[PDB]
């Protein structure tokens, strides 16, 4: 129906591997998928401590839209943490972006700070069970928290329904990660200009065991998106457990947004 | 008259270019068993930070999996499982640790011997698979001045000669993580010949598929005659990475494998 | 009847591309008369970690300045030298430290004003001075979807243009350490003009030669009398370095400058 | 006389900038002269952290080696710890270099480990006085000691005779640095097949402050070098204190080595 070119962006600690099942689904409806490795994730050669904020993080996603040929637009699809990059990427590259697509998502904002929906995210679910965390100096002084997730957390709250071979796949590849939660407190907040006029659609289930219910609903009465698809059931990684429904919602989108 | 069912610890080896990712079928199929799996990441491969040019040997590439042998617990004793090119991991392995090793498991892969330079079943698999069609090669200079050949493998290999049968989401997957690699072939060339009272000594199970599109039939049969294995299993079907298009069949023969060595 | 002899605290700034070891022998002789002085690298200049596609605006690239400003002792004074584009870090200073400064003085330096957009005497020193010969340009998009334009300074310019009379050890050093630079003229351009209560307030000595090869002696005069200086001083020869083919001089009237608004 | 082309290396924690005197003086006599800035120092774009080796530290000068059209040949000459380098360098690339000129500098040997000379001058001069010191650990796990350079230090032993407009620079454009002496008592010794073979110059002056008279008497005893200068006088920084004794004592090297 519309063919689209898709830019599928993991989320913090992943890879764009988490994309293995959704970028042939969407290919075989004819549309062109882009998967990209943030900084320090997946098989990007970096490693987290040389990364200073999250928008060195979200490097690969601008080059990329800066070689885009001229008049070329595309859907951005994130997850999870991902949504700071979307909002990131349509400051800088507006009219490249015919989408921003949030798939259990954080949503922000222009009207807060650049960290507030990370602080919301933490608020709901404080604890991340046995994940440890570090420390890193930045360039510029500032102490970064780093992450390692841990794997009772990854098999119960991310990857819950995902099957024993899905989460196998996680934790072999499986990195560290940062939200740069303290630098983002410090950013400007995001324009109404760039990332304020892009077409925004939010896909999340109430099934989903990390960004729980009542965050998402709390997220979307907050900044309420052009389009919110719920899916039935299926975990936070609906692009594994749900990977045919959000190719579907996905042709709705390119449908929609072309 | 009197079965033996055996639990074992399988450490499982990839091949070069790959990482631990490539076990992530067969890892959860050994442990529905009740066996412990230890599914390494060897240097510059998977998510190991190094990178290929700071390696400068095969068995450089291959401490990840001397220094987990080095640590086994004493009396502890593993059953290596490797792919493709691993098989060289294993030799280097049991000519440090044969004692700690149970049997090693070659799977479509390289099967070296004592007789001939450690580099010699790597030139005959070149000589029967000579091109590798869209991979891209490169060269760096290692720590005592030998140039060492890299190679970024290319996708239409990868589709239709390593991962011929293989799931969309296999093939997509490998293409999201593939790294570059080495043979490291001309330092192998040098390298001393593997130990008879190491890696002579231990048990050999060949498994193999003449569907296999890159180690094939009468590369795989050569090695065989060249050096008889204890045990030959040939899966009928699949493709090159039998872990992921025969999984349940490759873990049930692994069973066999526990039950007579481990 | 009764002289005065001040010390003071100068703070230097170096012009986009440079950094603080430009005034490596101008700080020296300025202690040697008592003086404090602090040089200053701005954002990704010198040996500042950053690199100029993290830096938004001229007011981010002037960060370690403002940060030093802040830092300052209460009632505590600084008399800022700039070089070349660093009138525009005075301009931006003077306008959140208006108290914290006694004079701003201009080396063959860009003289804002309050008057006009803050890009003004950067347009008008581009339309004197347009063909930058050996430079290579590059851009960027900024926070917001700016593009902006970066800079490698040609070679050539270097020898010529910029150090025309320096010592070839000096130009040989300039070539060592030299980084890309920006104007972000177009985002200074889009800013809100300088203040009358902050810069429009401050002391302004304007020092400057009529040798220089590259802020040419109409340009120079133009911003003279476009925006007319507390003082002008006009060194005989030496080239657009002054604090490096004309340093004791520069020096000396430096410390007429602290005797004066010290 | 003979026309050389030189590579010049700088010490840890400082850059290509030390050589800005000497460059000048050679290229005046015909020669053609290459100073890199090592990993991580003068304006590298690297940090010190994600440096996790010597040998990594050398790439700069690995990489242009590795580039040298056939035929061509250099002289390397090195400053205090950049005979590291050299012996590195020579291991890999034995047949582009016509000779190793070590100024004030280790010289290391076949025989022991690759950081025996660094033992060696930390017990000759084991307090850095003001210098501060930091650590990281590598990516394989290693903890990797750096200091920043105390300008006690600088002044007196390492710049002792220089010009305060020298010293002042020195100071300008100085970074963090890093022996790895952990990961070089690690490493495989020089061999004697690359570095082993090549020709080897030391220039050193008895009046030096930091690399005092007894070590360096020591090194010479220890590997003796094919031909050995003393500088009257100068300080540890000869290619600044004694720049055109340096230059003609190059192109005797030059002369020699062709
Ligand atoms: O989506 C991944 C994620 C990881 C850690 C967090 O703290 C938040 C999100
Ligand atoms: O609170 C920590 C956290 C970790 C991973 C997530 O995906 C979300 C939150
Ligand atoms: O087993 C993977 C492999 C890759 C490249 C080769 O040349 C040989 C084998
Ligand atoms: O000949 C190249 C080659 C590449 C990959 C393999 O797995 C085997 C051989
Ligand atoms: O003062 C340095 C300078 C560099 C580039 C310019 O375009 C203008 C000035
Ligand atoms: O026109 C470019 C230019 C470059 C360097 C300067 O210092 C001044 C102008
Ligand atoms: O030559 C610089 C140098 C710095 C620190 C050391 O510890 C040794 C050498
Ligand atoms: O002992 C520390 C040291 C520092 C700088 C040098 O140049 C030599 C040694």
């Known amino acids: ?3 689209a070119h898709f830019v599928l962006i993991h989320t913090i600690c992943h890879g764009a591997w ?11 409806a004819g549309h062109k998928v882009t998967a990209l490795d943030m900084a320090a994730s997946g098989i990007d ?23 885009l040929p001229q008049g070329e637009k595309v859907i951005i699809v994130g997850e999870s943490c991902a949504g700071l990059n979307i909002a990131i990427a349509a ?3 507006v009219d490249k972006i015919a989408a921003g697509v949030f798939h259990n998502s954080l949503l922000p904002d222009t009207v807060h700070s650049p960290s507030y929906t ?15 965390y570090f420390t890193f100096t930045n360039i510029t002084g500032e102490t970064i928290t780093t992450m390692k997730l841990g794997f009772v957390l990854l098999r119960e709250n991310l990857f819950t329904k995902c099957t024993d071979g899905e989460y ?3 934790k072999m590849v499986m990195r560290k990660g940062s939200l740069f939660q303290n630098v983002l407190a410090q950013r400007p907040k995001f324009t109404e200009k760039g990332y304020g006029s892009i077409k925004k659609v939010y896909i999340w289930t109430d ?11 709390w997220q979307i009465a907050n900044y309420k998106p052009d389009k919110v698809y719920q899916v039935q059931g299926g975990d936070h990684k ?7 429904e959000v190719a579907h919602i996905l042709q709705e989108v390119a449908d929609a947004y072309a």
């Open 207 to 217: 099934q989903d065991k990390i960004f729980l219910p009542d965050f998402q609903r």
């Open 118 to 132: 990370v602080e919301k995210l933490l608020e709901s679910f404080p604890d991340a069970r046995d994940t440890e």
């Open 45 to 67: 050669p970096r490693q987290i401590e040389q990364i200073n904020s999250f928008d060195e993080y979200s490097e690969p996603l601008l080059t990329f839209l800066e070689k």
């Open 91 to 93: 400051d800088r590259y």
């Open 238 to 244: 609906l692009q594994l457990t749900k990977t045919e």
């Open 168 to 170: 196998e796949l996680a």
């Open 18 to 28: 988490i994309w293995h099942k959704l970028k042939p689904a969407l290919e075989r």
């Open 1 to 3: 129906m519309v063919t």
